[PDB]
Symmetry: D3
């Protein structure tokens, strides 16, 4: 009766995925799959680590904790072995494509793929859906942070004169963002050139961007993040319906936990690929349906 | 292709249900069913009003806008004619019973019943479910108001010395409520007897309750309401995950609009009875799946 | 004893003015005056609609619900028939002119004109006045929205490549505004030309302006609006006196309701033209002076 | 052209009244009237201090800064000398009586009395009036503090075992108040007797009351105060209109400043007695009408 | 140059103390001291664990992570071996006693004891001190939670009919607390007896207390906590100075981290015992004095 | 036993310093030192005013209330007479220099200098220090205002066409500031030249700057100010620790009061110069150590 889960990849969300699986009484961790099996941090000392998911035996579902660019090929491979897949694929514009690619393969092998099951895309996606169900006309805004942006950190690091970089995302409302960029300069680089180059880069040129030089970028890092979603709109013909959702959260802890909840849900769907807005919300939860209904509805 | 809807009952939510149906391009109002067809307010002048749903022809789904005590018998009758039912049945402790009673009948007649599809139970139920999917351990609180409580207004009206009454629900946090009761006294009643009797009544004795005498209770009435839900808990093994949902809304406008969204969803489920936490959230929405996914996920 | 009111014009605020008049027990609706009497929406089926105010008989006061540019000529004409006028004339820089023009005419015909009696100008004007009465030195800021700006919507619609447009006003504090513009493009228009042209237009060039392309501008529309006023200043010689006023409101509902309250006040003033800061606030209210004083002061 | 003002009484608001008069360019301080002329604090060294208002010559208006119980007799006496009166008479239930008593006398001597012109009653009274003008149906709440309550401090001091006392008013919403009472005990008094007696006293028995013993009550004193007013109600037939007013203020500084603004207004009214909701708000302000209209409306 | 630290006791704060020591580059963990050395959780696999601090060699300072009742005897013993002590001793009324007991012993052995170095007592104590330095007159309130209270959980567990219990502390302002108690009942216990007994117990009888029965108390547990401190008072002779401090934090993570900061500070004081308000704040920090001054002041 | 204090300089903070000294029971004002002894405002009528500190006899400590540029030379002179010095020297980048210059001189003459003891630098500096003690990794932001900036007012006044100017500092979060500049134009100056010149000046070119023309700049002035500090970071290895500090305060009242608290602390330090993060916080307070510990810790 226990849901047998493999963790594929072990980035930041990998360690938190392990924690989420161990905490879930209804899940059995059958092991971790990574390219370098000899890098073993403290928490993987007593955990089966392989470079081939087949060595873990019977596996119901795989949490894909791999880089964005690897998710598609990785999910097809694991669906093709008759294992379910959950990912947190974060590229909004490409989610419809990923769904159709994986739907073909999931259906051929009678398995379920749940895609883009982080907090955004993921949880937040369900809240945005609920807001249109409550008031279909009007405007929704999603406001991120304060939190780190990996994408923007990389983009700033990859400029001439920048040894290391940290980009913070700051919410200014109505989906508008301020970017606070902290840079370690390469010995002998010119600050004003680096600053102008970061501000002019395609990742930053749309947005109010500030750049400050620092000694250590690492001591600024915190995986705390957050969201403030607003909806102002019309229920039927009644205007000025106001809805708001906020959270102050640990980024990878939430991403990994929602992926585990999605993996649980994956076991109760007809073969195919699904965004989290296509899953009944109660399917994300452990326990007896009627106890859950009595507690929640 | 248009979803053909009948409104059964026409209380407060009835008028707002009519507005929600008219506003929905994908819905066709095939008429209103009520016991007194000769009470016709301005908005029902050009609307078909019958005392028998059979006279409305082909009807896909019925919005049950009737008193709580009538919902069960009413839903079985309409499911038995081969029509779907949506209600906002608001008695939390009885939802599991209602679901099983209606599931039998819905399945015999190959129809769908969506029950308890207001904002609480309803929308709020989905948010509470999402909070356990994001952080299964910890505490959720649901804080109502300020808004009118019909139940508590009735309970106070039904006491000796009280001509009319209005009970306000005031949120004090962690699910604790203050009740502000405004009373019109019957000519010659004793205030302090009425006050003590209201405070001692079973509907008020658990709660901080204040009673003030007024001339006109009607001029205090406003159908505005609201909720503040909090969840503080654990994602995997990471503590102090903080989530919050708020809305300031028109009560019947939201209740009726969510019922219309639920009616839309009813057309896409396998025969049976469902709480709204058992429906994929995107099924509540009008439009092309892939356009919705691109917009929301 | 009942205040006999005509509604002249029937734009957006027209429908809400009708609602406000019907709700007021001390007001009798003697009819609606409009240029096209054959456009009759559901709510005007049983309402007298004429193109000549003289056909409505004895009329104490007219609510001018007409375009800004028409208000002056319209008010002089109706004052000249011996009827009071209330408008929500919204051009701040021209209010002193309008007052003097109408004061001449109101005094000749022994009638009262109340001008600029919306929420801004209107209600907000009284709050700004009270803030100087409480602390004459210091700074007041008035922060609008989120809400639709008709002026800015029109200005964006009236550009090459723009089929339809919606401009949102977003408050950023200290009277500074962000403008979120949503555009429907004419078949074959170039987005980046339209975007730059909107941002460079005189209505938007002072302000942080964002432009997004959409399918349907209508589904974003909501007549919800709001204000946050701050005053920080000196009472006598005591500094750091902090005052704040907020509202989240239905825009036309409030505008029309304040106009009805102003019409009530118009019946108790000496002949002339008045801004709402020149009227005793209690004159806006129905009821017995002493009951009102006991309730409010 | 300068408004000639006498200050009668010199309690706490007396010192602040002097500051407000000196700061107002349009006011000339013609002196201070008090029973003990030989108690002269630093600020009254160069100020004319008399026990008879007649010695101050031509006086347009008197600020009555005397105890509540003295205001009525004091105002009649000064109106009878042909001088205007402003007070901050704070007993809400008695304001209609005070108005009629003073109206008789003000009219006989062709003078103006403005009564109950503090912040509550006073400023707050105008905001409550405006809220009914904007939305006549619904509920208003006025929430005080945190701030000192003189009434409640006295009531606690006047109990057996209490040398000195300070009562704080704490807002809990919907007009419900918590009272934090700090007591200095008389040498040899029993705490639990004093505590129960304070909690059972008529001034405290309606309200959640806490009592803590302290060494020095004086070091806790701060004349900071505040208000949060809410209105939730109906504009015309549109529900869930939300309005809010807040201030964090110096109590006597605001009381005295509003009294000076009221004194300015007193010079522009027809003979009689007035609450501040019966005065046009612009009459409270110094300057040219048209400059004020351009700035405020 | 590295500060050599032993962890004595390994309760909840023990695990977090280990994390805080490992994270600090200027600290060297020389081991953990506990009574049961054979209970070894995952994180202590490669950590020296002894029942005698002498086996750890040269130790500069000991973090006392032991029960409250053990701290005094434990600190004297370790000071007597020529090692510094830091504790988070949480009994406010006994801190002056603990300081004098440890001051004698610290001075005899030329060592430093820092006591009551959690967040309250601890960090919060410094903020309360700063508030009197900024405004010596007025009132400070410290508002805890929402968070778990170990003291109150124990007190409720230790009642007849209660298998397990969790007490939540809820802030209601001005230092007033609501207690939400969740109980697992012993097979066959009577709820209403248990409820009344918890509410009447000395730990709960002063406070608004609610009791709810649950299946699993463990799934409600979260070590998140928080504080809201307010100060309203006088700077010199200027009233209504408003100060506020908030945090939403992991309870043991903060307690343990402040203890590590205090241990760092302990190395720079003259022999004796100290509360954290007797230590220069910069002594809590790693780094070069002048770099810290440039960054912070 | 009374701390004997001289006030040197009498700018804005001078008057408030006098108030703070008079209010402190443990301080004796031995006089005021200023260049112009014949400018004597109301409050200095009975106060000894000299141009030579030696005439005031035995003085323990001097509050330097002089311009920034004068503080260094002034402090050396007064330390050299065997008197302690407190200043609020506000140039952050130069604090390490000032400390070393004054440390030499303070040590030669066996006296104490406390520097940069306002609210920023000063109080805020201690809060920023505490935030690193609680969570050493992460980001702190300090957000100022709304309040007047003297520096920015001067910079705008000192431009061609500007008779007078007031610059307001507005917090936009993450240490980013908006500047609202109000200008009185010299008879015949061109607004658009003045506006562009202010916006291009080095004091404003980094920041969002708005310029409005006004009649009287003086009537906008208020010495109210404020701060919002945030810290988001890591306690040990636990992320998303959230800390916040706010105040709404009278600027000079707080600056002067903290300087008096610092002067008190100066009497208990070993000879030298100190920033306020190098002083034990309890040394800022009057009273018995053990009473303070019992009250605060």
């Amino acid at each position: 009766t226990k849901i047998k889960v493999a963790i594929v990849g072990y980035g930041n969300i990998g360690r938190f995925a392990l924690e989420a699986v161990q905490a879930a009484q209804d899940f059995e961790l059958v092991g971790v799959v990574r390219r370098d099996i000899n890098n073993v941090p403290e928490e993987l000392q007593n955990i089966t680590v392989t470079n081939d998911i087949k060595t873990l035996g019977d596996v119901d579902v795989a949490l894909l904790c791999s880089p964005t660019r690897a998710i598609k090929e990785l999910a097809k491979s694991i669906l093709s072995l008759g294992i379910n897949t959950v990912d947190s694929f974060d590229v909004h514009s490409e989610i419809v494509s990923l769904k159709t690619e994986l739907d073909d393969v999931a259906k051929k092998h009678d398995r379920v793929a749940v895609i883009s099951a982080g907090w955004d895309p993921g949880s937040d996606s369900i809240v945005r859906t609920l807001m249109l169900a409550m008031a279909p006309k009007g405007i929704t805004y999603t406001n991120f942070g304060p939190g780190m942006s990996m994408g923007h950190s990389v983009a700033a690091k990859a400029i001439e004169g920048v040894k290391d970089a940290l980009s913070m995302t700051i919410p200014l409302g109505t989906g508008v963002h301020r970017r606070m960029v902290y840079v370690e300069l390469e010995a002998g680089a010119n600050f004003n050139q680096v600053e102008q180059a970061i501000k002019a880069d395609s990742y930053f040129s749309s947005d109010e961007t500030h750049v400050k030089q620092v000694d250590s970028v690492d001591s600024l890092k915190d995986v705390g993040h957050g969201v403030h979603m607003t909806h102002k709109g019309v229920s039927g013909k009644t205007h000025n319906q106001l809805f708001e959702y906020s959270m102050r959260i640990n980024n990878p802890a939430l991403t990994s936990q929602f992926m585990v909840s999605a993996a649980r849900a994956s076991m109760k769907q007809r073969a195919g690929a699904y965004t989290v807005i296509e899953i009944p919300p109660v399917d994300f939860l452990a326990g007896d349906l009627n106890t859950l209904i009595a507690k929640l509805v």
